[PDB]
Design a protein around this nucleic acid. Structure first.
Lengths: 50, 228, 93
RNA sequence: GGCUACGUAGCUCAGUUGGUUAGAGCACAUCACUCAUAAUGAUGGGGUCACAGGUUCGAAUCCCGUCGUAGCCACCA
RNA sequence: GUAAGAGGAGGUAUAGGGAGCGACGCUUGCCCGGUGCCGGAAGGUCAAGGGGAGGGGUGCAAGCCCCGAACCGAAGCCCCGG
RNA sequence: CCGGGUGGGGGGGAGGCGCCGGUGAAAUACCACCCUGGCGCGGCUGGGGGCCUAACCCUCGGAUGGGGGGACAGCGCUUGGC
RNA sequence: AGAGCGCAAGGGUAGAAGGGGGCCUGACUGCGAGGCCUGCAAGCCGAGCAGGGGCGAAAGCCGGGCCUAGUGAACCGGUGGU
């Protein structure tokens, strides 16, 4: 169920993804959690859309 | 017998059918100020961002690539350390948490206020009825929150412009002073066009360049072909 | 009926208005897919002028009226006379 | 999902461009009358302006997010 | 009947079409909440159409072509009522 | 706004002011761009009604004409809808 | 070890998988040895390797949570992007 809406953590550097899920019912805002894209290393990873 | 006699001569200088541009406004609006003192260009800048649109207020914050005029003095109410910042700029009476009573209990004489984040709270929670509503206070961008605030003291003394969009977008672009020839006026009003285009909206359909009118103040008007 | 100027007769079946519903765009489609079939009539009218001896009617098509007027102009040069309504009308063109 | 509108006293409600200061109708309440009832009169209790954020020195009065809500449009692998 | 025209009807609302019960003698109560039928110069949505703020491709350029807002639109269903 | 504001006509006659001071968000001489509510005519583009016939519709002893209907209908496409 | 181990049980578990805390954020990238399962199609456990990163002095751990459900082939499209 939503209020926990899902998102695809898009990274900077012009794309590269890892897929997750939020939590609106929790104080969780946007999320720039440290993950590793298809190209490079454990750099950044932010949050976009659904 | 209305706008004076002088602006009936200065009426014999528009013939409600022109544009002038920043060119003829530079030279000719240098002429169209012949009266008193430092009539600041009044670029009357108008668009149509729905006279509130919750957000569309701009703040237009521009260095005026030439110079402002008199002394704002800034003041600052900067919690100790940043007093010292102001203490090297053009800012007098910095008193971190006590000149607040020399603003709330009487004393005045300063613009912008720059302050700092700390005192934003403090000195914005004791001055939100005269300074900020009229045109001073922390206003988290009126050159008034942070330490990017003495550099922006240099901005309040060398070129602020303030855009606030009440009923038109309005803003009264301010230089001219009726003593900066065609030169400085040309390059400065151009700088202002760049300022308008520096603060672009997020869905404002309408004329994002009509009214410019470059009337210094006590003289003509007639736009600038709202661009050049 | 049929235009006495440039022919042009009725039109049927996938002459049409289909309904269809039609595809196009809106999501995966406007309503995507969408498809059916129909029928299409042509125009036809009638105009009466005089010209020459007697009066005359034409089952003229739609946009072909000044063609008929031009036929009037052609008629005036020709030698029209006697009692022969459609017989002369035939000849006109 | 898109376009409209609207929900403020317990029920029922306008007020509608601000800048007001929260009504009207029954409902509750007590005193006045009278043989006493109801008819009556009066003073008060009760509004938390659909919930919340903001433009404004002062939104019920404008901007926005969700609800509730019906209208029809209109969309779905 | 696609029609042309035809019947109706060389009839005219004491006429001609439909439905309902089926002499005559006595009789006909509750509801517009639904639905249909009716009646309506407010209001809602809404088809093509008008429109043109913004916008794209392209060519040096004049330009050609397309996307296309605000606002205007009826029949219809909702809405007021019988 | 029952208080007064607006302006013309004019009697007229040597004069009438903004301010820091004061009050509030905000200061009223003088200048610069527009929103709200309307007046008057313009851009664009529609709503209702009446007057006439020459289109087209009906009828009159052959009607070349009279008459009425009259921009309606009818008709062909295109529109949605029931 | 009958407690607790999110929600059904079964099973297992304190020589932790429970209960508190510091630093983080491996619900990583490129793969894939080989098996369970089974008509297919999916489902399934995953040594070990190369980049890089967290923890811990280190040994060593991290390709989600004690586990057995928390699922939807393919076209048709939608957004970001090469």
């Amino acid at each position: 169920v939503r209020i926990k809406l899902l998102l695809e953590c898009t990274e900077c550097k012009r794309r590269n993804y890892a897929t997750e899920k939020n939590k609106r019912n929790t104080p969780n805002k946007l999320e720039l959690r440290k993950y590793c894209p298809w190209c490079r290393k454990h750099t950044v990873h932010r949050e976009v859309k659904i | 017998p209305k706008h004076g006699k002088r602006y009936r001569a200065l009426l014999e200088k528009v013939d409600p059918n022109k544009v002038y541009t920043i060119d003829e406004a530079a030279r000719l609006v240098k002429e169209l100020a012949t009266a008193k003192f430092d009539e600041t260009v009044e670029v009357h800048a108008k668009l149509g961002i729905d006279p509130r649109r919750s957000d569309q207020n701009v703040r237009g914050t521009v260095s005026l690539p030439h110079g402002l005029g008199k002394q704002v003095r800034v003041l600052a109410i900067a919690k100790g350390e940043k007093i010292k910042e102001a203490e090297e700029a053009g800012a007098d009476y910095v008193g971190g948490e006590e000149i607040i009573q020399k603003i709330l209990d009487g004393w005045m004489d300063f613009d912008a206020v720059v302050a700092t984040p700390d005192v934003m709270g403090a000195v914005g929670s004791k001055l939100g009825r005269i300074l900020g509503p009229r045109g001073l206070l922390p206003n988290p961008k009126a050159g008034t929150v942070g330490f990017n605030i003495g550099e922006i003291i240099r901005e309040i003394k060398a070129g602020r412009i303030e855009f606030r969009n009440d009923k038109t977008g309005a803003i009264h672009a301010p230089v001219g002073k009726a003593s900066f020839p065609p030169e400085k006026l040309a390059d400065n009003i151009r700088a202002f066009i760049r300022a308008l285009e520096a603060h672009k909206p997020e869905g404002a359909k309408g004329t994002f360049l009509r009214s410019v009118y470059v009337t210094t103040t006590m003289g003509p008007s007639v736009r600038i072909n709202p661009h050049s | 009926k049929v235009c006495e100027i440039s022919g042009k007769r009725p039109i049927v079946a996938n002459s049409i208005q289909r309904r269809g519903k039609a595809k196009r765009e809106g999501g995966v489609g406007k309503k995507t897919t969408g498809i059916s079939k129909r029928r299409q009539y042509p125009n036809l009218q009638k105009v009466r002028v005089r010209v020459a001896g007697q009066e005359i009617t034409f089952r003229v098509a739609a946009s072909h009226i000044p063609k008929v007027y031009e036929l009037v102009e052609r008629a005036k040069g020709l030698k029209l006379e006697g009692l022969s309504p459609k017989e002369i009308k035939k000849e006109l063109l």
